[PDB]
Amino acid sequence: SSVQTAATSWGTVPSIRVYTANNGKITERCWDGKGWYTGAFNEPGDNVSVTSWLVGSAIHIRVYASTGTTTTEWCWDGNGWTKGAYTATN
Ligand SMILES: OC[C@@]1(O)OC[C@@H](O)[C@@H](O)[C@@H]1O
Ligand SMILES: OC[C@@]1(O)OC[C@@H](O)[C@@H](O)[C@@H]1O
Numbered sequence: 001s002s003v004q005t006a007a008t009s010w011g012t013v014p015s016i017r018v019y020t021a022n023n024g025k026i027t028e029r030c031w032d033g034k035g036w037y038t039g040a041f042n043e044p045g046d047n048v049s050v051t052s053w054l055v056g057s058a059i060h061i062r063v064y065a066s067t068g069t070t071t072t073e074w075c076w077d078g079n080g081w082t083k084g085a086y087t088a089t090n
Pocket of ligand 2: 077
């Protein structure tokens with residue numbers, strides 16, 4: 001039905017990342033001050049949340065993608081999206 005989004009931002013320009021879960025696929029749109037464009041993130045999920053932090057000038061992003069009761073963490077640390085160590089509790 002209705003897509004579900006999550007958003008994060010950093011800096012002062014700023015940079016913004018908006019993740020949209022649509023029909024089981026999460027994609028990413030990006031802003032760094034000069035126009036929206038499509039990001040590299042593509043992962044399965046019906047629900048999405050996100051957080052990010054800076055270490056100096058380097059952004060680190062964590063996206064939590066959920067299907068059913070399984071949540072997978074995806075990490076951006078400058079070098080492509082890698083699977084994180086996040087696991088659920090009992
Ligand atoms: O410069 C765009 C980009 O590299 O920014 C960091 C992450 O949002 C990536 O998915 C995205 O493609
Ligand atoms: O560098 C990746 C990592 O260690 O970053 C911190 C947390 O997001 C962890 O789950 C994740 O595996």
